[PDB]
Design an enzyme around this catalytic site. Structure first.
Site, short mmCIF file in Angstrom:
data_model
loop_
_atom_site.label_atom_id
_atom_site.label_comp_id
_atom_site.label_asym_id
_atom_site.label_seq_id
_atom_site.Cartn_x
_atom_site.Cartn_y
_atom_site.Cartn_z
N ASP A 1 -2.68 8.99 -4.41
CA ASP A 1 -1.64 7.40 -5.01
C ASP A 1 -1.01 6.96 -5.13
OD1 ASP A 1 -2.84 5.89 -6.47
OD2 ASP A 1 -4.42 6.71 -7.77
N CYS A 2 0.12 6.26 -5.60
CA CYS A 2 0.44 5.78 -5.78
C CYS A 2 1.57 6.29 -7.35
CB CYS A 2 0.85 4.22 -5.29
SG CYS A 2 -0.01 3.17 -4.05
#
Ligand SMILES: *[C@@H]1O[C@H](CO)[C@@H](O[C@@H]2O[C@H](CO)[C@@H](O[C@@H]3O[C@H](CO[C@H]4O[C@H](CO)[C@@H](O)[C@H](O[C@H]5O[C@H](CO)[C@@H](O)[C@H](O)[C@@H]5O)[C@@H]4O)[C@@H](O)[C@H](O[C@H]4O[C@H](CO)[C@@H](O)[C@H](O)[C@@H]4O[C@H]4O[C@H](CO)[C@@H](O)[C@H](O)[C@@H]4O)[C@@H]3O)[C@H](O)[C@H]2NC(C)=O)[C@H](O)[C@H]1NC(C)=O
Ligand SMILES: *[C@@H]1O[C@H](CO)[C@@H](O[C@@H]2O[C@H](CO)[C@@H](O[C@@H]3O[C@H](CO)[C@@H](O)[C@H](O[C@H]4O[C@H](CO)[C@@H](O)[C@H](O)[C@@H]4O[C@H]4O[C@H](CO)[C@@H](O)[C@H](O)[C@@H]4O)[C@@H]3O)[C@H](O)[C@H]2NC(C)=O)[C@H](O)[C@H]1NC(C)=O
Ligand SMILES: *[C@@H]1O[C@H](CO)[C@@H](O[C@@H]2O[C@H](CO)[C@@H](O)[C@H](O)[C@H]2NC(C)=O)[C@H](O)[C@H]1NC(C)=O
Ligand SMILES: *[C@@H]1O[C@H](CO)[C@@H](O[C@@H]2O[C@H](CO)[C@@H](O)[C@H](O)[C@H]2NC(C)=O)[C@H](O)[C@H]1NC(C)=O
Ligand SMILES: *[C@@H]1O[C@H](CO)[C@@H](O)[C@H](O)[C@H]1NC(C)=O
Ligand SMILES: *[C@@H]1O[C@H](CO)[C@@H](O)[C@H](O)[C@H]1NC(C)=O
Ligand SMILES: *[C@@H]1O[C@H](CO)[C@@H](O)[C@H](O)[C@H]1NC(C)=O
Ligand SMILES: *[C@@H]1O[C@H](CO)[C@@H](O)[C@H](O)[C@H]1NC(C)=O
Ligand SMILES: [Zn+2]
Ligand SMILES: [Zn+2]
Ligand SMILES: [Zn+2]
Ligand SMILES: [Zn+2]
Ligand SMILES: [Zn+2]
Ligand SMILES: [Zn+2]
Ligand SMILES: [Zn+2]
Ligand SMILES: [Zn+2]
Ligand SMILES: [Zn+2]
Ligand SMILES: [Zn+2]
Length: 761
Positions: free
Chosen positions: A291-292
């Site tokens: 995920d970012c």
């Protein structure tokens, strides 16, 4: 990571991403006829996909490998290998594409309903078709350099706590059956079948695992330390990821920000290797994205690694291939210097990415998907499957016959903060749409004289608009109130703090109920709100849950209200009483009640009284349901299973019921099928659990259709204290729908049978 002042990622719901991570690149394809790669094996369309990617990766410098482990991969200009973007969104339509701002082509993509509403249709074929249209549109954009070839979808975490800011994005609270079904249909639609040679678009099932809150109690998702039993991990938090890897053969997966049992998901080899690859058969050359930027969070705030380089090495070696973020490309170089990673390890991850790109036709101009263009977007949009999905999913919760509106209704008072909804209808993760048809516009389009008043805001306490709203109700034949919640209430980065109607909407509704006119209330949004005062008010004639209904939402809503279409949607989460979220900490991950504050979570375990249950939905007609037993599971698993790849997919038997329309209105039919036991497997025993659902085409008055719901072995397994999935002998009972119109007891006999051995540690 890119914070300009002190940031507390243990509290703050949003990361501070670098502009590089967030950039919109201009994409293109390698020139395999004339460019620097023309004589390399990667450009040989007859060679094997792995051998092709291997030959390409052999040409990189170590720095170029490291830089291409980020989502905004720069490519390798000297090799004529373009920059490529891994971060593309497709949750319910394309988003983060390089949309054109004028000129016609590529200005928009189809905006489907949020997945929460689509799922309420209980139509598998519908979900598959949406995903097929999304992937067609994705390819069209890709062929113009405006979008990638892998997507960060579907979001399939269970919508466990009803205040989650992102539950709107999911197929609801039933992770095992309903969510897994969505997962399979969506992923196979995106990818173009079950692991086809010629991959259409790569899916990235998310978020693995234990992520289902943004920032409840100011504990940010970014540093959240989930404590989850092995039983719950197997039973609730992962079965949809098993379905993604094993059945749907997802090419990618995204690991979550949070830790589980002390280990950040992207640095969790038990998750990424032992479960994902060894237990569930995730493709050998599939790849995992963070995920970012979940890799950053391994360091800050998890403090599982002491710096960014160690966070990068830990994550890479655990099984994370691509960093959505800058932690890999800017610090794996330090990892290599420090001896913590080999070049082989870095090469493996980049080879994995490129192996998929080869399968996707990135190097093959003659690939069947490289000729889709703007007219394909136009044509597939014009099918109006976005409209169809909303029409099928809309849920009728309360009705006394007021709906569908009689032809005697000529004028309507159309009131409320959703009455003129356009962008509200799109939820989140949306790109520009071809149009947005509000309920107001659709109401006028349908022939009604419309007296429109805002009435009140979603979250005001101003009563300024009440008088004109009541005046309009007095002037009209019927009152249609549209309100509820929207993305100002529930959103990424910020959970709801309560599950009541916001602002003073209920006050306005109550006053509208005192005017003496028919009153229909539409409760909109993804999460549920406590409509107990509407359920109990006789003067509220009708109540509809309408979700986030997409680009044609207004017409879907009004086609239902006017009876041009008849509703058949059913709720995919529980509508809890408001006090529920105050009863116990919403980040208690234990599904089961604990005899203390936790009353049990979801319809499976909740010991209280829902305002409206999971599975609630009414029709414009009545149905008469009628049935149309001992099973030895070891014997059933002993037979051939043609038509099923995996033995746990074999039906133990098929529940068959006759469904007769005993009313006067042609209507589609939906059903959820639940099973109960009070003696099979370990105590405590659940309320019940979903084992099947279906939707039947329009049934005319006096006509019947057969409902046939197979009961697969996997759906009857329960989970022991070690996480093992086992089918236990004992007594079971099936119940059709929340109204339990038909019940069927059956017995499983013989020995316990193991379906999944849950791996230790
Ligand atoms: C569960 O979900 C599924 C999947 O979504 C539902 O099935 C879908 O139902 C929708 C809506 O009824 C269907 O949409 C229509 O599709 C038309 C194109 O289909 C035809 O061509 C395709 C492509 O080759 C074939 O695959 C189809 O054949 C298959 O499907 C049919 C059933 O549709 C089966 O009978 C076959 O056996 C095949 O399996 C078809 O041959 C499309 O033309 C149509 O779009 C027009 O109509 C709508 C509404 O009227 C307009 O909004 C839209 O703008 C279009 O109107 C244009 O064209 C008309 C001409 O009629 C003009 O008058 C207009 O001016 C305008 O120019 C619509 O999209 C969809 O095909 C179908 N999908 C699948 C996979 O089956 C299930 O119903 C649902 N189940 C339950 C129980 O609810
Ligand atoms: C089935 O599919 C077909 C094929 O796509 C769909 O048909 C299209 O329908 C759309 C929407 O109705 C229609 O687009 C309109 O075209 C009009 C004429 O060119 C435009 O005037 C109109 O623009 C308004 O709406 C936009 C938002 O949608 C606004 O952004 C824009 O500014 C305009 O808004 C003005 O008007 C509205 C209401 O009148 C008002 O609220 C505002 O204040 C503002 O003043 C649309 O662009 C297409 O022309 C149709 N295409 C074809 C080929 O027919 C059809 O809708 C689908 N059916 C279902 C049920 O989904
Ligand atoms: C690891 O790689 C990063 C990114 O390439 C390097 O950081 C760059 O250093 C150069 C040269 O000093 C600077 O001019 C750039 O501004 C830096 N870029 C960024 C994004 O920070 C870093 O120097 C490398 N570290 C080591 C030890 O080699
Ligand atoms: C309902 O919402 C639409 C969309 O927000 C409003 O349409 C705008 O109207 C103004 C003129 O009044 C235009 O300048 C804008 O360009 C329109 N926007 C779009 C996207 O079409 C509309 O005014 C609203 N109607 C009511 C009664 O509130
Ligand atoms: C960003 O926040 C971290 C704490 O999370 C802090 O250590 C760092 O110094 C901050 N950076 C800036 C520029 O303020
Ligand atoms: C950071 O946030 C956490 C979680 O809300 C909180 O407990 C902690 O006190 C905060 N730390 C600082 C230094 O503000
Ligand atoms: C969380 O922090 C916010 C912002 O500081 C504050 O307004 C709110 O009261 C806090 N919530 C709880 C439950 O402590
Ligand atoms: C169940 O089936 C197995 C294998 O077919 C058989 O050996 C066993 O005796 C059966 N048990 C019962 C209770 O019928
Ligand atoms: Zn040539
Ligand atoms: Zn060329
Ligand atoms: Zn298909
Ligand atoms: Zn291993
Ligand atoms: Zn932590
Ligand atoms: Zn910790
Ligand atoms: Zn560093
Ligand atoms: Zn977006
Ligand atoms: Zn019919
Ligand atoms: Zn007939």
């Amino acid at each position: 990571q890119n914070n300009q002042t002190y940031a507390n990622y243990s509290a703050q719901g949003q990361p501070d991403l670098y502009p590089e991570t967030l950039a919109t690149l201009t994409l293109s394809f390698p020139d395999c006829e004339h460019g620097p790669l023309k004589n390399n094996l990667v450009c040989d369309s007859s060679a094997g996909y792995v051998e092709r990617a291997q030959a390409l990766i052999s040409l990189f410098t170590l720095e170029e490998l490291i830089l291409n482990t980020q989502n905004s991969g720069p490519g390798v200009p000297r090799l004529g290998l373009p920059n490529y973007q891994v971060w593309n969104e497709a949750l319910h339509g394309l988003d983060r594409a390089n949309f054109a701002t004028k000129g016609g082509q590529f200005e928009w993509a189809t905006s489907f309903p949020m997945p929460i509403l689509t799922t309420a249709a209980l139509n598998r074929t519908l979900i598959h078709q949406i995903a097929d249209i999304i992937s067609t549109q994705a390819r069209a954009f890709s062929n113009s350099g405006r979008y990638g070839l892998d997507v960060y979808a579907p979001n399939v975490n269970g919508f466990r706590s009803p205040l989650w800011g992102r539950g709107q994005e999911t197929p609801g609270e039933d992770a095992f059956f309903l969510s897994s079904a969505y997962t399979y249909e969506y992923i196979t639609g995106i990818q173009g079948g079950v692991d086809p040679e010629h991959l259409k678009v790569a899916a990235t099932v998310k978020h693995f695992a234990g992520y289902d809150l943004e920032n409840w109690n100011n504990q940010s998702r970014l540093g959240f330390d989930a404590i989850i039993t092995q039983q719950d991990l197997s039973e609730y938090y992962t079965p949809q990821f098993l379905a993604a890897a094993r059945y749907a053969k997802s090419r990618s997966l995204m690991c979550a920000y949070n830790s589980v049992n002390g280990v950040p998901s992207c640095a969790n080899s038990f998750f990424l290797q032992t479960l994902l690859r060894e237990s569930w058969g995730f493709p050998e050359w599939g790849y995992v994205s963070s995920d970012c930027d979940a890799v950053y969070n391994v360091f800050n705030p998890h403090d599982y690694a002491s710096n960014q380089s160690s966070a990068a090495a830990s994550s890479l070696r655990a099984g994370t291939d691509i960093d959505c973020g800058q932690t890999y490309p800017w610090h794996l170089n330090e990892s290599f210097v420090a001896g913590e990673v080999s070049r082989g390890e870095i090469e493996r991850s980049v080879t994995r990415l490129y192996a998929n790109l080869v399968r996707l036709g990135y190097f093959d101009k003659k690939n069947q998907y490289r000729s889709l263009g703007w007219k394909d977007v136009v044509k597939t949009d014009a099918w109006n499957i976005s409209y169809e999905a909303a029409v099928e999913g809309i849920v009728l919760l309360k009705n006394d016959g007021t709906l569908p509106l009689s032809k005697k209704v000529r004028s309507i008072a159309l009131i409320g903060p959703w009455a003129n909804a356009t962008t509200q209808m799109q939820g989140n993760y949306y790109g520009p749409a071809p149009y947005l048809i509000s309920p107001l516009e659709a109401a006028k389009k349908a022939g009604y004289h419309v007296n429109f008043e805002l009435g009140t805001e979603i979250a005001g306490n101003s009563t300024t608009g009440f008088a004109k709203a009541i005046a309009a109700a007095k002037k009209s034949d019927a009152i249609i109130y549209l309100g509820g919640i929207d993305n100002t209430i529930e959103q990424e980065g910020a959970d709801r703090t309560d599950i009541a109607w916001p602002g003073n909407q209920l006050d306005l509704i109550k006053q509208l109920s005192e005017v003496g006119k028919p009153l229909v209330v539409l409760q909109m949004g993804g999460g549920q709100v406590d409509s107990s005062s509407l359920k109990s008010n006789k003067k509220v004639n009708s109540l509809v849950w309408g979700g986030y209904p997409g680009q044609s939402g207004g017409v879907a809503l009004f086609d239902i209200l006017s009876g041009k279409r008849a509703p058949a949607g059913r709720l995919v989460t529980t509508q809890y009483p408001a006090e529920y979220v105050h009863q116990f900490p919403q980040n208690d991950m234990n599904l089961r009640p604990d005899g203390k504050s936790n009353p049990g979570q979801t319809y499976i375990w909740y010991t209280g009284k829902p305002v409206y249950e999971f599975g609630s939905g009414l029709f414009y007609t009545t149905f008469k349901e009628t049935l149309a037993l001992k099973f030895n599971t070891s014997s059933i698993l002993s037979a051939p299973h043609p038509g099923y790849t995996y033995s746990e997919q074999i039906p133990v038997f098929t529940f068959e019921a006759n469904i007769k329309n005993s009313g006067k209105t042609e209507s589609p039919y939906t059903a959820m099928l639940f099973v109960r036991t009070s003696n099979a497997g370990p105590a405590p025993y659940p309320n019940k659990w979903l084992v099947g659902f279906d939707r039947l085409a329009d049934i005319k008055p006096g006509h019947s259709s057969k409902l046939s719901i197979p009961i697969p072995v996997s759906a009857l397994a329960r989970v022991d204290s070690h996480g093992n999935r086992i089918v236990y002998p004992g007594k079971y009972e099936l119940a059709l729908n929340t109204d339990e119109s038909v019940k069927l007891e059956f017995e499983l006999v013989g020995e316990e049978v193991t379906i999944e051995n849950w791996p230790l540690e």
